Each structure stands twice: as C-alpha cells, then as structure tokens.
Amino acid sequence: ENIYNRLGEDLNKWQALLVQIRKARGTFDNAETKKEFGPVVIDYGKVQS
Amino acid sequence: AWTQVLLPKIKNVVHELRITNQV
C-alpha cells in the first residue's frame, strides 16, 4: 500500500520501478550459487530459493 | 565402427535444462 500510494499514477501506474526490479533480479536468479572474491567466498546457498 | 559406437574414441556430449525468468 505504501508503494502504491507513493507512486500513484506514474508514467501510467508505476512503469518505472517495474523496470529496475528486473535489473534487481541481478545478484540473484543465476546458475552461480556462491560469489567468490579473492580468498573470501560468500555463499548464498540457504537463500537462493 | 564410429557409427555403431554411436548406436573409436567418442567424446561425451552433455547439455543441461535450466530455467530463467521462469522459462
């Protein structure tokens, strides 16, 4: 409800955040299960589903 | 010999099924 009120009657209704959400599907929804970086591996295994 | 092997060293070809944006 907060989102709906905040973006009441946008480009049509939202039309904008519905675009950046698909980009926010990043860091996510990929065959990769753990992000490596140097010697630090951060595994998002328990949350991926 | 290759044909009957299909049915001579053959490489094993493998491909996967995945899903993305729920497709």
Curated annotation (Swiss-Prot), chain A:
The organism's place on the tree of life at top rank: Eukaryota
Location(s) in or outside the cell: Cytoplasm, Cytoskeleton
Family: Belongs to the dynein heavy chain family.
Subunit structure and binding partners: Homodimer. The cytoplasmic dynein 1 complex consists of two catalytic heavy chains (HCs) and a number of non-catalytic subunits presented by intermediate chains (ICs), light intermediate chains (LICs) and light chains (LCs); the composition seems to vary in respect to the IC, LIC and LC composition. The heavy chain homodimer serves as a scaffold for the probable homodimeric assembly of the respective non-catalytic subunits. The ICs and LICs bind directly to the HC dimer and dynein LCs assemble on the IC dimer. Interacts with DYNC1LI1; DYNC1LI1 and DYNC1LI2 bind mutually exclusive to DYNC1H1.
Functional description taken from the UniProt entry: Cytoplasmic dynein 1 acts as a motor for the intracellular retrograde motility of vesicles and organelles along microtubules. Dynein has ATPase activity; the force-producing power stroke is thought to occur on release of ADP. Plays a role in mitotic spindle assembly and metaphase plate congression.
Free-text comment about domains: Dynein heavy chains probably consist of an N-terminal stem (which binds cargo and interacts with other dynein components), and the head or motor domain. The motor contains six tandemly-linked AAA domains in the head, which form a ring. A stalk-like structure (formed by two of the coiled coil domains) protrudes between AAA 4 and AAA 5 and terminates in a microtubule-binding site. A seventh domain may also contribute to this ring; it is not clear whether the N-terminus or the C-terminus forms this extra domain.
Illness the protein is tied to: Charcot-Marie-Tooth disease, axonal, type 2O: An axonal form of Charcot-Marie-Tooth disease, a disorder of the peripheral nervous system, characterized by progressive weakness and atrophy, initially of the peroneal muscles and later of the distal muscles of the arms. Charcot-Marie-Tooth disease is classified in two main groups on the basis of electrophysiologic properties and histopathology: primary peripheral demyelinating neuropathies (designated CMT1 when they are dominantly inherited) and primary peripheral axonal neuropathies (CMT2).
Name of protein: Cytoplasmic dynein 1 heavy chain 1
Lineage: Eukaryota, Metazoa, Chordata, Craniata, Vertebrata
Complete-protein stretch covered: 1066 to 1114 of 4646
